[PDB]
Design an enzyme around this catalytic site. Structure first.
Site, PDB file in Angstrom:
ATOM      1  N   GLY A  75       0.801  -1.205   0.000  1.00 44.12           N
ATOM      2  CA  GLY A  75       0.000   0.000   0.000  1.00 44.12           C
ATOM      3  C   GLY A  75       0.842   1.267   0.000  1.00 44.12           C
ATOM      4  O   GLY A  75       1.970   1.265  -0.494  1.00 44.12           O
ATOM      5  N   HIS A 130      -4.490   9.804  20.706  1.00 43.02           N
ATOM      6  CA  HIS A 130      -5.750   9.278  20.194  1.00 43.02           C
ATOM      7  C   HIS A 130      -6.569   8.608  21.299  1.00 43.02           C
ATOM      8  O   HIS A 130      -7.807   8.692  21.309  1.00 43.02           O
ATOM      9  CB  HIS A 130      -5.502   8.284  19.050  1.00 43.02           C
ATOM     10  CG  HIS A 130      -5.041   8.917  17.778  1.00 43.02           C
ATOM     11  ND1 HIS A 130      -5.132   8.276  16.563  1.00 43.02           N
ATOM     12  CD2 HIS A 130      -4.448  10.104  17.526  1.00 43.02           C
ATOM     13  CE1 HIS A 130      -4.653   9.057  15.613  1.00 43.02           C
ATOM     14  NE2 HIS A 130      -4.234  10.180  16.169  1.00 43.02           N
TER      15      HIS A 130
HETATM   16  N1  LIG Z   1      -0.112   6.047   5.003  1.00 41.41           N
HETATM   17  C1  LIG Z   1       0.278   6.857   6.130  1.00 41.41           C
HETATM   18  O1  LIG Z   1       0.583   7.997   5.964  1.00 41.41           O
HETATM   19  C2  LIG Z   1       0.277   6.283   7.534  1.00 41.41           C
HETATM   20  C3  LIG Z   1       0.591   7.126   8.551  1.00 41.41           C
HETATM   21  C4  LIG Z   1       0.604   6.656   9.818  1.00 41.41           C
HETATM   22  C5  LIG Z   1       0.292   5.336  10.090  1.00 41.41           C
HETATM   23  N2  LIG Z   1      -0.022   4.479   9.073  1.00 41.41           N
HETATM   24  C6  LIG Z   1      -0.392   3.099   9.406  1.00 41.41           C
HETATM   25  O2  LIG Z   1       0.574   2.086   8.646  1.00 41.41           O
HETATM   26  C7  LIG Z   1      -0.173   1.058   8.323  1.00 41.41           C
HETATM   27  C8  LIG Z   1      -0.030   0.946   6.755  1.00 41.41           C
HETATM   28  O3  LIG Z   1      -0.613   2.167   6.281  1.00 41.41           O
HETATM   29  P1  LIG Z   1      -1.061   2.247   4.708  1.00 41.41           P
HETATM   30  O4  LIG Z   1      -1.624   3.654   4.506  1.00 41.41           O
HETATM   31  O5  LIG Z   1       0.029   1.885   3.764  1.00 41.41           O
HETATM   32  O6  LIG Z   1      -2.319   1.183   4.611  1.00 41.41           O
HETATM   33  P2  LIG Z   1      -2.945   0.775   3.153  1.00 41.41           P
HETATM   34  O7  LIG Z   1      -2.651   1.753   2.009  1.00 41.41           O
HETATM   35  O8  LIG Z   1      -4.363   0.344   3.351  1.00 41.41           O
HETATM   36  O9  LIG Z   1      -2.054  -0.542   2.712  1.00 41.41           O
HETATM   37  C9  LIG Z   1      -2.137  -1.717   3.459  1.00 41.41           C
HETATM   38  C10 LIG Z   1      -1.760  -2.787   2.383  1.00 41.41           C
HETATM   39  O10 LIG Z   1      -1.519  -3.955   2.985  1.00 41.41           O
HETATM   40  C11 LIG Z   1      -2.652  -4.996   2.484  1.00 41.41           C
HETATM   41  N3  LIG Z   1      -2.914  -5.791   3.636  1.00 41.41           N
HETATM   42  C12 LIG Z   1      -3.687  -5.625   4.699  1.00 41.41           C
HETATM   43  N4  LIG Z   1      -3.582  -6.682   5.488  1.00 41.41           N
HETATM   44  C13 LIG Z   1      -2.730  -7.547   4.909  1.00 41.41           C
HETATM   45  C14 LIG Z   1      -2.298  -8.787   5.329  1.00 41.41           C
HETATM   46  N5  LIG Z   1      -2.698  -9.458   6.546  1.00 41.41           N
HETATM   47  N6  LIG Z   1      -1.405  -9.456   4.600  1.00 41.41           N
HETATM   48  C15 LIG Z   1      -0.980  -8.907   3.432  1.00 41.41           C
HETATM   49  N7  LIG Z   1      -1.424  -7.685   3.002  1.00 41.41           N
HETATM   50  C16 LIG Z   1      -2.294  -7.002   3.773  1.00 41.41           C
HETATM   51  C17 LIG Z   1      -3.632  -4.177   2.083  1.00 41.41           C
HETATM   52  O11 LIG Z   1      -4.468  -4.883   1.075  1.00 41.41           O
HETATM   53  P3  LIG Z   1      -6.086  -4.706   1.253  1.00 41.41           P
HETATM   54  O12 LIG Z   1      -6.389  -3.229   1.077  1.00 41.41           O
HETATM   55  O13 LIG Z   1      -6.714  -5.593   0.197  1.00 41.41           O
HETATM   56  O14 LIG Z   1      -6.462  -5.165   2.628  1.00 41.41           O
HETATM   57  C18 LIG Z   1      -2.937  -2.983   1.367  1.00 41.41           C
HETATM   58  O15 LIG Z   1      -2.479  -3.212   0.098  1.00 41.41           O
HETATM   59  C19 LIG Z   1      -1.647   1.327   8.599  1.00 41.41           C
HETATM   60  O16 LIG Z   1      -2.192   0.694   9.668  1.00 41.41           O
HETATM   61  C20 LIG Z   1      -1.602   2.864   8.931  1.00 41.41           C
HETATM   62  O17 LIG Z   1      -2.711   3.133   9.921  1.00 41.41           O
HETATM   63  C21 LIG Z   1      -0.014   4.962   7.792  1.00 41.41           C
END
Ligand SMILES: NC(=O)c1ccc[n+]([C@@H]2O[C@H](COP(=O)([O-])OP(=O)(O)OC[C@H]3O[C@@H](n4cnc5c(N)ncnc54)[C@H](OP(=O)(O)O)[C@@H]3O)[C@@H](O)[C@H]2O)c1
Ligand SMILES: NC(=O)c1ccc[n+]([C@@H]2O[C@H](COP(=O)([O-])OP(=O)(O)OC[C@H]3O[C@@H](n4cnc5c(N)ncnc54)[C@H](OP(=O)(O)O)[C@@H]3O)[C@@H](O)[C@H]2O)c1
Lengths: 426, 425
Positions: free
Chosen positions: B11, B213
């Site tokens: 992601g 939070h």
């Molecule tokens: N992006 C940011 O700026 C940010 C900032 C702070 C914290 N975070 C935290 O970091 C974590 C990742 O963030 P993100 O924005 O990159 O989330 P995201 O865009 O939704 O990406 C998560 C990826 O991992 C897949 N996934 C979920 N569960 C999986 C599993 N058990 N096994 C394999 N693949 C899996 C998802 O596929 P599906 O969508 O099909 O489930 C998706 O492709 C999140 O929890 C987020 O809250 C992110």
């Protein structure tokens, strides 16, 4: 009857609200006196064309809108005759001494009461010190003006807008057990304000809200920098830094000044107030979620740290009006968006200060000089005076004394404080 | 030293990490994304020639770049023993599931496993799932180091980073660890400062969301907004009645910080000065509002002063004090972040937003873990109860059949027990 014929001294925003309340009650004849100037010229023109006083209430205050007729207007005290039983001083509180000295008391022997609409500690005594020997007049001190009122358009000097009304103010009298207090309770009740009679003038004067609030907030560095500015943004009177002057340091100054003023009151035989309960219950409240009742009622026995925290919360909670209706996204009305008025050139080309902070400084300077007679140093108050004095001095340095009105120059409050103390001891 | 790197969870986070890895220098780049619509879109995009595409916004324009994906998998059983480094870019609540699902008995080549958003106990939880002989080192990053999102799902491998953090913290299961210095340099290419710490729990204890939070968005006001379908959403960082910040919420924040700090001490980690952490790692205020001496002295101030200082901090940031002023003197209203609210998913079922679902799950685990250290965490438990009661009433009103199962009750005690057993080993 107890008011008789009433002469309003000063005919600005406060006077127009007071006139509406007096005409509801029944004032006999209602006159006004205002010193010569552009405003008086405009007033005489409006009255001569048949205009009346007009008071509009804003928003939830729309209910009190009304019109009031003025029987006579004077901008020349030589035309006054002994026709008046009540004088109501609607001039700035820092002008009370000048204004009382300038009244033609030889033609005012029938005056029985003189009301100070925005009193401060020592004002009753100062006014009495200036009255002629043997004067019969009782002097009444109202704690604070009981609303927020502005003349919207200076070219319609007789039309004012009231945008807030206080819940409660206090009234003292130079006459013990004074019956005029009840008359004025009734007059102000017409606009929904509760007047609480107190036993001495100084007790009521000790409840002047602007002394407690304007002193710590508008005599500090931030406010003075905005007020003495000609370029740049004016900023906002009741916002937090950097949009406005409210900081933890300003709140600490507010607490420490309240302590100093409370000790002065005790030395003058008056009961001090609970600052937080006064602000919340008498002036404008917040929800229990922000200030719990137990914290409000207990404020005077809380530690200094808790007291400052509660005062900060009070002002942060009123950056918006928490009782206003929310819009679609959940925003409330921006209550703290009153801009600072700034220095401006008068019709002689000289810089003048706005009433905030000039009046605030002059009041506090007199209180500090009075407190010296009670062996009270008032260091926090003196720090605020020094902040103002240093800032205005730098402004004069930069602009040139040639360009500044003499009201910006150093004053001596010791003569007036001595008159107050002598009246006190008499 | 990175070798071939497998990104687990392809992601937004993974796309930023991939470009930082390529800037540093790595071997083959692979990804594992579990089955679903996103994986279907990725597979088609890759078939049509797509690559990982990072765009930096504004001042971060220089982060922009492309990276080829060498291998894409959906099924963990299909992994070959060709990976030296795994990076977990999935939600942290899924770390245990992901690790349990991998065929570790035939992944002997894995040397390093990086947890990008590690909660307290995450390193220990992951290690409890590894087979007895497993020699992988587990790294805990305190939080993701940027703000990144996939712009449009029709271009599933193109992400936008709008901002980069000042500082994050990194700890390792291996004392005095070297994969640790490599990842310090890798992530530094984004502009973040990575501070290595001596244990994983020290890094896990330095995530702002745990401290902020929990008190603000598990309380009654936030939950009423989040669970509403009509009316204004309100604002996440405003004072009551526009947002959830009240003296009571600030008291909860202080009390929870004390509870978390004692848990960290019992796990052998030095806790943090909350006000200094917020000011220096999240966003500063002027000396006029929070004197430096008050910030540095916060941990030794009395409780009353600590609450006052925290309240001032949030009030001072209702607007951005460092933004340019408009003509009247107003600053930018950066506290007007609207609450995200419940939404129906593709199957018609109500879902909670990640705030506060992820925050509740993290704190529920922390409380269960703390019980093993003889810590009752009453403030934490009050916030958990607030969430549980509000969500339970929502289910009552909407019907369990209309609600996604992620709203139903959870039990974190098994994971907490695994963490405690691993810690005692
Ligand atoms: N992006 C940011 O700026 C940010 C900032 C702070 C914290 N975070 C935290 O970091 C974590 C990742 O963030 P993100 O924005 O990159 O989330 P995201 O865009 O939704 O990406 C998560 C990826 O991992 C897949 N996934 C979920 N569960 C999986 C599993 N058990 N096994 C394999 N693949 C899996 C998802 O596929 P599906 O969508 O099909 O489930 C998706 O492709 C999140 O929890 C987020 O809250 C992110
Ligand atoms: N209006 C409010 O909402 C409010 C709130 C709190 C406290 N107060 C206090 O109430 C007092 C009056 O306020 P206001 O708004 O009615 O003022 P205003 O609208 O400016 O009216 C003041 C009146 O008195 C005259 N005046 C001013 N200075 C004078 C002086 N040195 N000598 C003789 N007359 C003078 C003015 O005429 P010229 O303009 O021709 O001088 C004007 O007619 C002030 O102390 C104020 O701080 C008012």
């Amino acid at each position: 009857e107890s008011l008789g014929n009433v002469l309003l001294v000063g005919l600005g925003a406060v006077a127009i609200q007071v006139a509406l309340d007096l005409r509801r009650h029944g004032a006999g004849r209602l006159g006004a006196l205002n010193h010569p100037g552009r405003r008086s010229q405009r007033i005489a023109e409006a009255l001569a064309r048949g205009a009346c006083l007009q008071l509009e209430g804003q928003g939830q205050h729309r209910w009190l809108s009304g019109n009031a007729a003025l029987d006579v207007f004077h901008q020349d005290p030589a035309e006054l005759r002994d026709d008046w039983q009540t004088l109501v001083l609607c001039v700035p509180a820092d002008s009370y001494l000048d204004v009382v000295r300038g009244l033609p008391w030889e033609r005012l022997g029938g005056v029985r009461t003189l009301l100070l609409v925005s009193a401060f500690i020592g004002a009753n005594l100062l006014v009495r010190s200036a009255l002629p020997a043997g004067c019969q007049a009782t002097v009444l001190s109202l704690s604070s003006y009981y609303a927020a009122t502005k003349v919207i358009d200076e070219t319609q000097p007789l039309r004012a807008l009231t945008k807030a009304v206080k819940r409660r103010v206090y009234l003292g009298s130079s006459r013990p057990d004074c019956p005029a207090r009840e008359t004025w309770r009734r007059v102000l009740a017409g606009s929904g304000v509760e007047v609480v009679p107190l036993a001495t003038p100084e007790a009521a004067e000790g409840r002047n809200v602007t002394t407690y609030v304007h002193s710590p907030f508008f005599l500090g560095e931030f406010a003075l920098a905005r007020i003495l500015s000609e370029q740049g943004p004016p900023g906002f009177m009741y916002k937090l830094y950097p949009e406005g002057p409210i900081t933890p340091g300003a709140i600490g100054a507010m607490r420490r000044l309240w302590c100093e003023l409370s000790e002065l009151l005790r030395r003058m035989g008056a009961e001090p107030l609970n600052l937080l309960r006064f602000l919340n219950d008498d002036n404008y409240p917040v929800h229990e979620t922000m200030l719990p009742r137990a914290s409000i009622d207990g404020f005077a026995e809380a530690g200094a740290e808790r007291q400052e925290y509660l005062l900060f919360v009070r002002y942060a909670a009123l950056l918006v009006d928490p009782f206003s209706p929310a819009d679609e996204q959940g925003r409330h009305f921006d209550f703290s968006a009153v801009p600072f008025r700034r220095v401006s050139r008068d019709e002689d080309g000289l810089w003048r200060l706005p009433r905030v902070p000039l009046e605030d400084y002059r009041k506090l300077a007199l209180i500090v000089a009075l407190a010296a007679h009670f062996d009270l140093a008032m260091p926090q108050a003196r720090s605020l005076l020094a902040s103002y004095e240093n800032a205005v001095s730098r402004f004069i340095d930069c602009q040139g004394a040639s360009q500044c009105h003499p009201s910006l120059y150093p004053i001596d409050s010791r003569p007036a404080a001595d008159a107050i103390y002598r009246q006190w001891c008499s």
